[PDB]
Ligand binder design. Structure first.
Ligand code: ATP
Length: 241
C-alpha cells in the first residue's frame, strides 16, 4: 500500500502551494495512471514517495510505515523510477542497466532489455552490451537511451515502479511493444504511470486526473471517456483532430 494523508506541499518557504490536501490510497499491486495538464503536479506527487521533499502537512505512508521516520536505505529498495530524461553515465551499457547492483545476472539483464525492447538493437553494436557509451551517449539516440532507462528500472526489481512518461521519446511501435510487455512488467508489483500519451494508461486499473494540484477525477479509461464533461475526455478528444 501507498497512502497520502492530507498532504499539503510547496517547494520553498514563501512559494505557492503545489499540492493542496491530497488524499490517495494506492493499493498494493495496483496499476495507476496519473494524467493532467502540464504543471498540474503529477511528478511532484511522485517526488514525495521518494522523499526528496517532505510536506508541511499530512503524511506519506508505504505499507503502514511513515516515510518521515522510515529508514532511507529501506525506502530506496521500495521505489524504482524511470525519471524524466533520467541521465545516464559515461560507461558501458551493461553498467548503466546494472546500476542497481552489477556483478548480477548473466541473462536476466537481457530479459530486462527484451522487456524494454532494447535487446534487439543492442545486438548490432560493436561490443554488444559492453559497448562504451558517453555522457551524451557516444552511440545512443533519444529513444534508445530511454529504453536503457526502462531496462535499468526493471533490473532494480522494486516493489513500486514509477513510470515517469517513459515512452515520450519512442515511436508508436516501440511504445506498443512495451505496452504488450506491461503485464510482465507489472506482475506482482505496484506501478505508477505518468502519461501525456493517454494510450500508455488505457489498461491501468485506475486513472487519477490532476488539475492545479488537486485530484479532480478518477476511473478506468472507458469510464472517464464515457463522461463527456470530464476533463480526461476533453484531453483525449484533442489528440488527432
Ligand atoms: N523544483 C521546483 N521548485 C519550485 N517549483 C517547482 C519545482 N518543480 C516544479 N515546480 C512547480 O510545481 C508545479 C507542478 O510541477 P510538476 O513537474 O509536478 O507538474 P507536472 O504535472 O509533472 O508538469 P509536466 O506535465 O509539465 O511535466 C508547477 O507549477 C511547477 O512550476
Amino acid at each position: 500500500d501507498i497512502t497520502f494523508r492530507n498532504i499539503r506541499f510547496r517547494y520553498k518557504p514563501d512559494s505557492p502551494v503545489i499540492l493542496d490536501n491530497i488524499n490517495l490510497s494506492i493499493k498494493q499491486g495496483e496499476v495507476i495512471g496519473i494524467v493532467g495538464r502540464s504543471g498540474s503536479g503529477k511528478s511532484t506527487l511522485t517526488k514525495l514517495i521518494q522523499r526528496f521533499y517532505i510536506p508541511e502537512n499530512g503524511q506519506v505512508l508505504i505499507d503502514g510505515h511513515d516515510l518521515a521516520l522510515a529508514d532511507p536505505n529501506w525506502l530506496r529498495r521500495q521505489v524504482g523510477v524511470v525519471l524524466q530524461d533520467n541521465v545516464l553515465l559515461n560507461r558501458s551499457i551493461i553498467d548503466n542497466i546494472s546500476l542497481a547492483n552489477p556483478g548480477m545476472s548473466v541473462e536476466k539483464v537481457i530479459y530486462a532489455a527484451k522487456l524494454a525492447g532494447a535487446h534487439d538493437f543492442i545486438s548490432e553494436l560493436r561490443e554488444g552490451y559492453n559497448t562504451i557509451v558517453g555522457e551524451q551517449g557516444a552511440g545512443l539516440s533519444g529513444g534508445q537511451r530511454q529504453r536503457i532507462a526502462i531496462a535499468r528500472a526493471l533490473v532494480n526489481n522494486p516493489k513500486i515502479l514509477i513510470f515517469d512518461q517513459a515512452t515520450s521519446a519512442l515511436d508508436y511501435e516501440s511504445e506498443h511493444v512495451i505496452m504488450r510487455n506491461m503485464h510482465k512488467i507489472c506482475k506482482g508489483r505496484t506501478v505508477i504511470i505518468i502519461a501525456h500519451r493517454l494510450s500508455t494508461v488505457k489498461n491501468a486499473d485506475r486513472i487519477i486526473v490532476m488539475e492545479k494540484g488537486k485530484i479532480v477525477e478518477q476511473g478506468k479509461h472507458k469510464e472517464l471517456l464515457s463522461e463527456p464533461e470530464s476533463l480526461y475526455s476533453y484531453l483525449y478528444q484533442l489528440q488527432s483532430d
